Design a protein around this ligand. Structure first.
Ligand SMILES: C[C@H](CS(N)(=O)=O)c1ccccc1
Ligand SMILES: C[C@H](CS(N)(=O)=O)c1ccccc1
Ligand SMILES: [Zn+2]
Length: 140
């Protein structure tokens, strides 16, 4: 689990979104595993605006942060899970590291801020849903 809180937005894994997230839906993309909902409280998170390929992610299944190199956001074939059939997930970044389903929502951070959230895993890889292209997360 986990979310990004920026302005009046909450960013979550689309497959972990709650009834309240869907009741307050701003934007969702099934191809990206992202959903953004509106919040009443102001979020303080800073979104990175950059092309970093190094950062640190939180891994709840190890209670640890790990430094990783990760690929630029791309269209990656992702195996079926129970939340999706096998499909191309877009805007996905891969790194070598540990990820279990409950790790979804762990933040990946660079020097500039929040890069994305854990979305996929298995075969010793971790996939992060990029958010850096969502420039609208920083206004109204
Ligand atoms: C929020 C919606 C249904 S509702 N109550 O009409 O908002 C929802 C249904 C199933 C899984 C996740 C979310
Ligand atoms: C079992 C699934 C497979 S997938 N292809 O990543 O959806 C999963 C593993 C680890 C983290 C998140 C999800
Ligand atoms: Zn950066």
């Amino acid at each position: 689990s986990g979310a990004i809180y920026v302005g009046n937005y909450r960013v979550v894994n689309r497959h972990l979104a709650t009834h309240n997230d869907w009741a307050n839906l701003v934007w969702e993309d099934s191809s990206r595993d992202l959903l953004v909902s509106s919040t009443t409280a102001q979020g303080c998170d800073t979104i990175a605006r950059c092309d970093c390929q190094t950062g640190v992610y939180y891994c709840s299944s190890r209670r640890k942060h790990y430094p990783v190199s990760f690929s630029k956001p791309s269209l990656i074939f992702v195996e079926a899970s129970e939340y999706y059939p096998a499909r191309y997930q877009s805007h996905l970044m891969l790194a070598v590291g540990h990820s279990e389903p409950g790790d979804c929502g762990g933040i990946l951070r660079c020097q500039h801020g929040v890069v994305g959230i854990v979305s996929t895993g298995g075969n010793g890889l971790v996939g992060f849903a990029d958010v850096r292209d969502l420039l609208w997360l920083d206004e109204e």
